[PDB]
């Protein structure tokens, strides 16, 4: 089920990043390429990211600024942050934080004319999700559970 789920995880990442890019006027296309339908997982993740970024904006903005990104250091910075994020374990809130962090990195990369990073950040997120989070996700009910526990019927 690994890569039955690995194509799906890739699509979740692309959809979240495409949505965060679109909120600022950018587009994903410019920089490259169980019971609840995947459109609901996508929307619940979009929703959760929005509520996370809204409620923790200052703490989250301050933290996104403290790591000075360059195309030659971005990969190491991303992996180090994510290692620390999940050091003590995984819960759905940290996965939401993981997605919002990646989206924030994509948007900042475009702002600062580091657009080569946009598609790579997606690859790193999907690889980490597929290689290091999907076991927990599978063990914890799959994405059905995320929507059931954090879904909201107001978009």
């Amino acid at each position: 089920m690994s890569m039955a789920m690995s194509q799906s995880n890739r699509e979740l990442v692309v959809d979240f990043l495409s949505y965060k890019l679109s909120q600022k006027g950018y587009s994903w296309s410019q920089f490259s390429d169980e019971g609840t339908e995947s459109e609901a997982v996508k929307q619940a993740l979009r929703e959760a990211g929005d509520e996370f970024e809204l409620r923790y904006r200052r703490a989250f903005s301050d933290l996104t600024s403290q790591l000075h990104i360059t195309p030659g250091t971005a990969y190491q910075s991303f992996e180090q942050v994510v290692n620390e994020l999940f050091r003590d374990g995984v819960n759905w809130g940290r996965i939401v934080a993981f997605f919002s962090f990646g989206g924030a990195l994509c948007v900042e990369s475009v702002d600062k004319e580091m657009q080569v990073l946009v598609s790579r950040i997606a690859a790193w997120m999907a690889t980490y999700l597929n290689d290091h989070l999907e076991p927990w996700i599978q063990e914890n009910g799959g994405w059905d559970t995320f929507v059931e526990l954090y879904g909201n019927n107001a978009a």
């Binding site: 959760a48 509520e51 409620r55 703490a59 933290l63 620390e84 050091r87 940290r94 939401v96 526990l149």
Partner: peptide, 24 residues
Amino acid sequence: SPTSEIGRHLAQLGDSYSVRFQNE
């Protein structure tokens, strides 16, 4: 160091999120 601290506050926020916006 920036990354380790950035990761820890992200974890803090995610844990707050997971409690706040739980609906079941």
